[PDB]
Every structure is written in structure tokens, then in C-alpha cells.
Coordinates of N, CA and C and ligand atoms in Angstrom, one line a residue:
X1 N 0.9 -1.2 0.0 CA 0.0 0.0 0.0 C 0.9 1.2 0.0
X2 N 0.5 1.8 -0.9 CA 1.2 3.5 -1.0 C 1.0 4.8 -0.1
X3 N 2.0 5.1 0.3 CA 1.4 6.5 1.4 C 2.1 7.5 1.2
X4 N 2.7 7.3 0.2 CA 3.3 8.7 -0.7 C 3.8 8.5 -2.1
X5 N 3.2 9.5 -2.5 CA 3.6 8.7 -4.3 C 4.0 10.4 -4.9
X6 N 4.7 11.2 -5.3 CA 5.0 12.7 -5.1 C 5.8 12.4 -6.7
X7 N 5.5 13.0 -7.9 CA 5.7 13.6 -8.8 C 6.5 14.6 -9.3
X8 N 6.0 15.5 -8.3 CA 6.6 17.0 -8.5 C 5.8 17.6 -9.8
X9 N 4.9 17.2 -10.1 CA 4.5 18.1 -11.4 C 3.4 19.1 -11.0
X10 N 3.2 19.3 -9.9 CA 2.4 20.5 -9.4 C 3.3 21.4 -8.3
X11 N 4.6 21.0 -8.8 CA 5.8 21.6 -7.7 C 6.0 20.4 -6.4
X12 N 6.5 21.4 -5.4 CA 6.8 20.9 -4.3 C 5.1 21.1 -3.4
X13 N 4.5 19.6 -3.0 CA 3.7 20.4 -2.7 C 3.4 21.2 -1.3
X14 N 2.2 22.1 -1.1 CA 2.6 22.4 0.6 C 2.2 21.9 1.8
X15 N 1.9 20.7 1.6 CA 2.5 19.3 2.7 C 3.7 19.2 3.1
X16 N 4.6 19.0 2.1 CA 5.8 18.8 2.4 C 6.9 20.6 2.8
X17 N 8.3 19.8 3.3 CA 8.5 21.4 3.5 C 10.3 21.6 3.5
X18 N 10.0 22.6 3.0 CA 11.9 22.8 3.1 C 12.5 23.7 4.1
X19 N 13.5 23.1 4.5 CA 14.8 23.9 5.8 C 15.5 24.4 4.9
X20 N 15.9 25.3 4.6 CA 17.2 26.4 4.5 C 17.7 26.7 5.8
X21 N 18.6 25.4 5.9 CA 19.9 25.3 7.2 C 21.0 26.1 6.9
X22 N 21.4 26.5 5.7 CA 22.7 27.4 5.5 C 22.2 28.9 5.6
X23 N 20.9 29.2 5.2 CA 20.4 30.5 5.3 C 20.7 31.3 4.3
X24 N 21.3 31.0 3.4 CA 21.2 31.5 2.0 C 20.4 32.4 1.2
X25 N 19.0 31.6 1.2 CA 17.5 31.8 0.6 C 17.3 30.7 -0.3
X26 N 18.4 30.1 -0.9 CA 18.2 28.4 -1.9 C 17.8 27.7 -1.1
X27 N 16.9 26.8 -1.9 CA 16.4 25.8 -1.1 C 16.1 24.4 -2.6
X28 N 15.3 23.6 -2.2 CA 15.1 22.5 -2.9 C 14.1 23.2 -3.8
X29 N 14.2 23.5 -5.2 CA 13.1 23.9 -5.6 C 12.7 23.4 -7.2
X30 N 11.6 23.7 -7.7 CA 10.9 23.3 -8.9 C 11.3 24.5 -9.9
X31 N 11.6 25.2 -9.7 CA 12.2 26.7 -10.6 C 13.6 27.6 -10.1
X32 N 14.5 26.0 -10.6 CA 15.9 27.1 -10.4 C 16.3 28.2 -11.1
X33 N 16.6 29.1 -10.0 CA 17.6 30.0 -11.3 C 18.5 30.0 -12.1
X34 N 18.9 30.6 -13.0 CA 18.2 32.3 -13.3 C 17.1 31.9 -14.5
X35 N 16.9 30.5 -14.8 CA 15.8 30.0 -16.2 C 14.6 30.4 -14.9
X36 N 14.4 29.6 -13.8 CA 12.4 29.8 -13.5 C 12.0 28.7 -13.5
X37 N 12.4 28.1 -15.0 CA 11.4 26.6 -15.3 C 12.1 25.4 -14.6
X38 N 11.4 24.1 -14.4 CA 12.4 22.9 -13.5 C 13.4 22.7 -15.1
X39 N 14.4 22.0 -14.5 CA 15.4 21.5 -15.4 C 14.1 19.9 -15.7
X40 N 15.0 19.0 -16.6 CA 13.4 17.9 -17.1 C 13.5 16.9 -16.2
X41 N 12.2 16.5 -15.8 CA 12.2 15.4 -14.8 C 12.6 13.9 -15.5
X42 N 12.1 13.1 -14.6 CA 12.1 11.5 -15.2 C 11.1 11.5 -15.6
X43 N 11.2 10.9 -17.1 CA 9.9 10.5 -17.7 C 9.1 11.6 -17.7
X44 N 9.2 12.9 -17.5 CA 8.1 14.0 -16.7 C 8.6 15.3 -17.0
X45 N 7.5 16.7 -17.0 CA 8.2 17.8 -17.2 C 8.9 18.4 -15.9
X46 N 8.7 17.7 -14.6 CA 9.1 18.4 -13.4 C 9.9 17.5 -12.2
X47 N 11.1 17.9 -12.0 CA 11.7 17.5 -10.7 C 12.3 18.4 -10.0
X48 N 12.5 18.9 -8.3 CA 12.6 19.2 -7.3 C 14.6 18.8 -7.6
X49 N 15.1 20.4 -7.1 CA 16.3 20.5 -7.6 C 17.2 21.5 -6.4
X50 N 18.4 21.0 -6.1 CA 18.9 22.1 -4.9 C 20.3 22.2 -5.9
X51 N 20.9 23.4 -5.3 CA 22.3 23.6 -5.9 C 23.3 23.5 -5.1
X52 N 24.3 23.2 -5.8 CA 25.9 23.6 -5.2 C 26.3 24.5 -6.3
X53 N 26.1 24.9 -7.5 CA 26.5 26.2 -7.9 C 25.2 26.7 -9.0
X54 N 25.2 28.4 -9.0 CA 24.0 28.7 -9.7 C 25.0 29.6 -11.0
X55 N 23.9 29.2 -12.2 CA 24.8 30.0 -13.3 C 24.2 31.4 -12.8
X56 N 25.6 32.8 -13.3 CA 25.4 34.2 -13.3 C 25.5 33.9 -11.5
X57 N 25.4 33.6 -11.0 CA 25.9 33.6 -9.4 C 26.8 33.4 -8.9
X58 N 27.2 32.1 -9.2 CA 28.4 31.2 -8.5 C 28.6 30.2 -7.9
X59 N 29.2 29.2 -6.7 CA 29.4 28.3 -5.7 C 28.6 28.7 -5.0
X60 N 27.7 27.8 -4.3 CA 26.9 27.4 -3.4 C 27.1 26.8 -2.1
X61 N 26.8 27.1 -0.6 CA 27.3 26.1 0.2 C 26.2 26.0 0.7
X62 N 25.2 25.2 -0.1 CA 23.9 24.1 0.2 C 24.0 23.7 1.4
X63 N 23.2 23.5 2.7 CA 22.3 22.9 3.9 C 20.9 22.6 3.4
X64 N 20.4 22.1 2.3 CA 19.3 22.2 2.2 C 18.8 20.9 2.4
X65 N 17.0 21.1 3.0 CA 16.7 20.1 3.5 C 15.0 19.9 2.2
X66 N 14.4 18.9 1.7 CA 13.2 18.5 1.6 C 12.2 17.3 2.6
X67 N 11.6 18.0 3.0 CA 10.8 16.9 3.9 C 9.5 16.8 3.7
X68 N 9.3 15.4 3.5 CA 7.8 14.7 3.6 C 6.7 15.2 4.3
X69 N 5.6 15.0 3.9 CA 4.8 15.2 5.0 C 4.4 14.3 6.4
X70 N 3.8 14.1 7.1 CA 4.0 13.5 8.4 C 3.1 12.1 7.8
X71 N 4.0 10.6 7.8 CA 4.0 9.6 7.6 C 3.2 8.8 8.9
X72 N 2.1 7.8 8.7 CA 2.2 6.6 9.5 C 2.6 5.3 9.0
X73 N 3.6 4.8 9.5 CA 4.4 3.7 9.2 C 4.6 3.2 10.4
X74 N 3.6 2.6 11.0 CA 3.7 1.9 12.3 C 4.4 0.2 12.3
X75 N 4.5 -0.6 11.4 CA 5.2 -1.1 11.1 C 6.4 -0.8 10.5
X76 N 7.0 0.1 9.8 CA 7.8 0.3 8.7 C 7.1 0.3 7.4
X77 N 8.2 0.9 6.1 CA 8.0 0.5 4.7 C 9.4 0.9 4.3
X78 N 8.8 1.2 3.0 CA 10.0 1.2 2.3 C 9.8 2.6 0.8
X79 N 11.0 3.2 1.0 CA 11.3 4.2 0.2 C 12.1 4.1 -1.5
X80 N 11.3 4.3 -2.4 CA 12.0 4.9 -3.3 C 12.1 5.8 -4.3
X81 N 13.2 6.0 -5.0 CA 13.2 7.5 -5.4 C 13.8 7.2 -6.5
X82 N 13.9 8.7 -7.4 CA 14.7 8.6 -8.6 C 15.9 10.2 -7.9
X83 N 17.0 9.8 -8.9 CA 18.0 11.1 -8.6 C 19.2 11.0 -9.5
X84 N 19.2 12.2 -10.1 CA 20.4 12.6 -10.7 C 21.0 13.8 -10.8
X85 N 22.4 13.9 -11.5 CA 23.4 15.3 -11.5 C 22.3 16.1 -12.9
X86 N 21.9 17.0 -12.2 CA 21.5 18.0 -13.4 C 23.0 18.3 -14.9
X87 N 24.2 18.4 -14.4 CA 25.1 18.2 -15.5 C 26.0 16.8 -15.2
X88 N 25.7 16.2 -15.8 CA 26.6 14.4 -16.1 C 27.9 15.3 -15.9
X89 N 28.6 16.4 -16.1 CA 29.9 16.5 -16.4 C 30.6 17.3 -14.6
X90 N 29.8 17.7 -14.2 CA 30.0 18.5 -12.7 C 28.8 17.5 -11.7
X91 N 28.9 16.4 -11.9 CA 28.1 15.1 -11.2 C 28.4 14.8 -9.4
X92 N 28.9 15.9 -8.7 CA 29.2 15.2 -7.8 C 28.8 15.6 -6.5
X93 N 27.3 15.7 -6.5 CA 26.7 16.4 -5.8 C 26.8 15.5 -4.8
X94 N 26.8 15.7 -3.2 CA 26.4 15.3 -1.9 C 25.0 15.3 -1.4
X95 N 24.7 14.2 -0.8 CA 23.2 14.0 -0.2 C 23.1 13.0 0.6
X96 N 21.8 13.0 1.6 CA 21.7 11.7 2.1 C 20.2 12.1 2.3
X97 N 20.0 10.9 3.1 CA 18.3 10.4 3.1 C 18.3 9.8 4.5
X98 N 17.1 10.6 5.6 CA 16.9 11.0 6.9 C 15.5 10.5 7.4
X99 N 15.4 9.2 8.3 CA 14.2 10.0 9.0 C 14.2 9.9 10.7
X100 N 13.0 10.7 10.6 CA 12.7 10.8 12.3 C 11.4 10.4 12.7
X101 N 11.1 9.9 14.3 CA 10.2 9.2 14.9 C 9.1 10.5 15.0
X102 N 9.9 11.4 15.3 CA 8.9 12.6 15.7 C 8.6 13.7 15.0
X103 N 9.8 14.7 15.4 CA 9.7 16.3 14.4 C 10.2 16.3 13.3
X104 N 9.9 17.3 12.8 CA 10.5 17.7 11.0 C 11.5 19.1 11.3
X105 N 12.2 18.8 12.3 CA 13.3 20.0 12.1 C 14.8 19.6 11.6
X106 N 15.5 20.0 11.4 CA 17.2 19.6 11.2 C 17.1 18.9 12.3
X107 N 17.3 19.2 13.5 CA 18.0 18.3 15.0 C 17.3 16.6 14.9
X108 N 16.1 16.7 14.5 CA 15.5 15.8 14.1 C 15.9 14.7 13.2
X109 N 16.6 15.0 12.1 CA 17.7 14.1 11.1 C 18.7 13.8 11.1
X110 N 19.0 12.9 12.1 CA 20.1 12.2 12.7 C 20.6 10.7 12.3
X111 N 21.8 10.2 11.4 CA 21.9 8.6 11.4 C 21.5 9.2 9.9
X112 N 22.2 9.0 8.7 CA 21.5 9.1 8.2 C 21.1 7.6 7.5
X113 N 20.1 7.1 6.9 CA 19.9 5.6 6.2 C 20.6 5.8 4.7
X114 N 20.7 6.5 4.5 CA 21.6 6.8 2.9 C 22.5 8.0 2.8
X115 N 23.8 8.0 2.8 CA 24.6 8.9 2.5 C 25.3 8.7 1.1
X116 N 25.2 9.6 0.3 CA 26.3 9.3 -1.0 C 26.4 10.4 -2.0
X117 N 27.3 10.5 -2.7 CA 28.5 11.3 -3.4 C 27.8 10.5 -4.9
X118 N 27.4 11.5 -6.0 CA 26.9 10.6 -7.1 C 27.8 10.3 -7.8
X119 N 28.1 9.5 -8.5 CA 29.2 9.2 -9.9 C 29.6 10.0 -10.7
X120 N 30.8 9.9 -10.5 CA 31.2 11.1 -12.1 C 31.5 9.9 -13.3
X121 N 30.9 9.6 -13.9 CA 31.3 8.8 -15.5 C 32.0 10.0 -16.2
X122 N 31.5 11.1 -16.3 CA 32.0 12.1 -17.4 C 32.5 13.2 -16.9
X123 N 33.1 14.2 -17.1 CA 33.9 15.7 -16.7 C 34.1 16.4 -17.5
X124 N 34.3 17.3 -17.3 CA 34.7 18.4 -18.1 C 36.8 18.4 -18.4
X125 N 36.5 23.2 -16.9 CA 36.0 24.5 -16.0 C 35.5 25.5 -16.7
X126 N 34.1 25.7 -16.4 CA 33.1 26.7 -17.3 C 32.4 27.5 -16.3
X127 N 32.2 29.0 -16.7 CA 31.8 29.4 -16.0 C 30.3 29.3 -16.4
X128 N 29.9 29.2 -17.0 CA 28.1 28.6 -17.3 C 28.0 27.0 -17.3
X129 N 27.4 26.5 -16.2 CA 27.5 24.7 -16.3 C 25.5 24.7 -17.1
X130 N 25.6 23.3 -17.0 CA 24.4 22.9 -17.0 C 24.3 23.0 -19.1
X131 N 25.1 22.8 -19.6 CA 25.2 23.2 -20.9 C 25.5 22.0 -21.9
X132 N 25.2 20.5 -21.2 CA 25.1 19.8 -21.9 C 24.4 18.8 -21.5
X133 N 24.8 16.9 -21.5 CA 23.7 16.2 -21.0 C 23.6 16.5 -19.3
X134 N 22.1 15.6 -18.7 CA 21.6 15.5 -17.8 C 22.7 14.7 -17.6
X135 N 22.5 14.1 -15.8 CA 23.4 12.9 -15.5 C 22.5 11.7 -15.9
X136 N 22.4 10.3 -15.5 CA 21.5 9.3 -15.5 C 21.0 9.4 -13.9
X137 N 19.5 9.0 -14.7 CA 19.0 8.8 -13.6 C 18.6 7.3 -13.2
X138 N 19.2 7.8 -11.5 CA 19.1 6.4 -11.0 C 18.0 6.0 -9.6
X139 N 17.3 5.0 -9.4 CA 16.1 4.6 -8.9 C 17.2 4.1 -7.5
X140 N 17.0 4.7 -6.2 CA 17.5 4.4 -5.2 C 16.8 3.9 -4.1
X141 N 16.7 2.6 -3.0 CA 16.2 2.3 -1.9 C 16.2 2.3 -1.1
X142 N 15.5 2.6 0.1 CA 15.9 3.0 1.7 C 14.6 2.4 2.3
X143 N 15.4 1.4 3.2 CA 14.3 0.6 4.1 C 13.8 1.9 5.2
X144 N 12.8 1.8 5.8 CA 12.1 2.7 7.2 C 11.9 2.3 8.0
X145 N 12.4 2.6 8.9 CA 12.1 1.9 10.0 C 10.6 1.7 10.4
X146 N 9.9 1.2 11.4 CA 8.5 1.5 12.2 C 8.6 2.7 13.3
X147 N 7.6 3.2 13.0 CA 7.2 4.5 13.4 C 8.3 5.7 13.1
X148 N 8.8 5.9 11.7 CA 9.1 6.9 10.9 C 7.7 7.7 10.6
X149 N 7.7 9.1 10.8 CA 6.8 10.1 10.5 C 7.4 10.7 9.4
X150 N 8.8 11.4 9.4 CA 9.4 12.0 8.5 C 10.5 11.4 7.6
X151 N 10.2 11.7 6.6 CA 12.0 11.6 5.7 C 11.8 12.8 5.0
X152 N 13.4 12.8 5.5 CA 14.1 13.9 4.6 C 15.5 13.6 3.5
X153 N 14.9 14.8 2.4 CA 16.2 14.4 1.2 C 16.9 16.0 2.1
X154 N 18.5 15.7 2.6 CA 19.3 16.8 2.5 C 20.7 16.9 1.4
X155 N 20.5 18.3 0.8 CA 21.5 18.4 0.1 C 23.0 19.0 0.7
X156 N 23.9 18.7 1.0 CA 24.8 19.7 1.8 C 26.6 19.0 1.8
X157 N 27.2 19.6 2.0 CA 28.7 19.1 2.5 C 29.2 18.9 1.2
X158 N 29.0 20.3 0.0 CA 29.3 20.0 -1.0 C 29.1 21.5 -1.4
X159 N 30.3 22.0 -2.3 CA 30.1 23.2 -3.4 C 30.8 22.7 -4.6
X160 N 30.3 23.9 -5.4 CA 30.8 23.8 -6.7 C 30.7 22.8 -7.6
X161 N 29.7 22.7 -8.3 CA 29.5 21.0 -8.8 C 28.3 22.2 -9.8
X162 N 26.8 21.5 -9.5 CA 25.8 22.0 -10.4 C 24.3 21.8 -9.3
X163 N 23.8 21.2 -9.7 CA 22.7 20.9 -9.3 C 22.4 19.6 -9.4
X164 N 21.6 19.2 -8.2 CA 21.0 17.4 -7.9 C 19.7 18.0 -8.0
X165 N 19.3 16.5 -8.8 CA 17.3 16.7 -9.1 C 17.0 15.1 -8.5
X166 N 16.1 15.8 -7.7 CA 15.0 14.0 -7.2 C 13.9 14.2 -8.4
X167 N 13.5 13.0 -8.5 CA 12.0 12.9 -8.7 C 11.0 11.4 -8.3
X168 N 9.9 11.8 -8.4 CA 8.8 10.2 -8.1 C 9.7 9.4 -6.9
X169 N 9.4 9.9 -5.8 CA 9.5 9.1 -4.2 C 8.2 8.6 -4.1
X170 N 8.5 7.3 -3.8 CA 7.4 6.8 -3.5 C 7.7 5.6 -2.3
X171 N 6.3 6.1 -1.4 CA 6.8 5.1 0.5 C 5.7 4.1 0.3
X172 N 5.4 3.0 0.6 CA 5.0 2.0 0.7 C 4.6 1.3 2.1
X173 N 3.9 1.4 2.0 CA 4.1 0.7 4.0 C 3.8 -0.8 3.7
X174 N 4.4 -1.5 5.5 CA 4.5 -3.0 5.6 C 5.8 -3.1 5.7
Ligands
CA201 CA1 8.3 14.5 -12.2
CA202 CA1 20.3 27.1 1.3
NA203 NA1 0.9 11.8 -6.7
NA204 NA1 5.0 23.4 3.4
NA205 NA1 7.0 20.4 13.2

């Protein structure tokens, strides 16, 4: 049985919620700058995107948080997702995948169940990135514990690269 199935093609919606832990004003979003529109989803016109560097801006030092809305998973379930490097050639975005029994704050996302650095297959120094392919997108799993309310995708412990895109999380309970 499904208890979250999230697309992103009506945006992020406002169930769910993002921390801006670095305080910047970036956050995970459906309209990065300086374009507006999402970069292309899976299979889809829309995926949820945070930066480590923005073209016409610069490096980035991302804390950013996406979080679910409040899960019952009294047994457990199970999570999955899609994620890739918005540029295959600057691929090496940092992330992990969080949950908590109780609150939806940073202090709250502790342990994380997935930490990882994505693959660079390909490389390039430009000062405009994002100027050629996408990375591949890859479908990732994360068991949940019982009695997870929250998961969170955090972007962080990472500049200068491009931008990471999720899309289609889907939780499952049992
Ligand atoms: Ca999508
Ligand atoms: Ca931020
Ligand atoms: Na949906
Ligand atoms: Na919200
Ligand atoms: Na709260």
C-alpha cells in the first residue's frame, strides 16, 4: 500500500517542507535560477532541484533540507526515489536520506539511512554549467524503519559542482 507517491509536477507540494539550514535563501526547488522553469524530470516535465553552484551567481554552500509530509508507518515501509546530476559533467553532488520518529526539524535528522557522493562517469572548467547532457537517472532504496513520521532528502557538505534533481519518491508501508 502507497502513502506517498509525489511527482513534483504541481511543484513541491505544501505538505511537504523545506529547511534552509545554510540560510542563504536556496532551497530545494521546482524553478531554479536564473531559467524559472524545472530543469526535465524523469519520464516528466518536473523534478525538485537544490544547488551547489548557480549559473550568473556562483558556488553554493547548500544545507538544504526536503521533507515529507507527516507519515504513519507503524510497522515500517519502504522508500524509493529517482536522482540525478543535473550536469553528467560537474556530477558530484552530496546528499543523504533522513528519517525521524517525531519532528520535521534539522535536529530531528540524525543517522542518516543513505549517504552518497553521485558518480562522475564524465567531466569536463566553465563558467556557465548545465550546458550539456543530464546525468543518469538512477532509482534508489531505503528501508524505514517502524514508526518513521518524517524523511528527509538533505543536500549539503558539497560546493561547486551543479545541481542534484529527485523525482517520483514513493513510500510504501509494511
Ligand atoms: Ca516528475
Ligand atoms: Ca540554502
Ligand atoms: Na501523486
Ligand atoms: Na509546506
Ligand atoms: Na513540526
Amino acid at each position: 500500500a502507497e502513502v506517498l507517491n509525489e511527482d513534483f509536477e504541481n511543484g513541491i507540494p505544501a505538505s511537504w517542507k523545506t529547511i534552509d539550514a545554510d540560510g542563504d535563501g536556496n532551497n530545494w526547488t521546482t524553478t531554479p535560477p536564473p531559467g524559472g522553469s524545472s530543469f526535465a524530470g524523469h519520464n516528466s516535465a518536473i523534478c525538485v532541484s537544490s544547488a551547489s553552484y548557480i549559473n550568473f551567481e556562483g558556488p553554493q554552500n547548500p544545507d538544504n533540507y526536503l521533507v515529507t509530509p507527516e507519515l504513519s508507518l507503524p510497522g515500517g515501509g519502504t522508500l524509493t526515489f529517482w536522482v540525478c546530476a543535473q550536469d553528467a559533467n560537474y556530477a558530484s553532488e552530496h546528499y543523504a536520506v533522513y528519517a525521524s520518529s517525531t519532528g520535521n526539524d534539522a535536529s530531528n535528522f540524525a543517522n542518516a539511512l543513505l549517504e552518497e557522493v553521485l558518480t562522475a562517469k564524465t567531466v569536463v572548467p566553465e563558467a556557465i554549467r548545465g550546458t550539456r547532457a543530464q546525468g543518469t537517472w538512477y532509482q534508489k532504496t531505503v528501508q524505514l524503519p517502524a514508526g518513521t513520521k518524517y524523511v528527509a532528502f538533505r543536500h549539503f557538505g558539497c560546493t561547486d559542482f551543479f545541481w542534484i534533481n529527485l523525482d517520483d519518491v514513493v513510500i510504501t508501508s509494511g
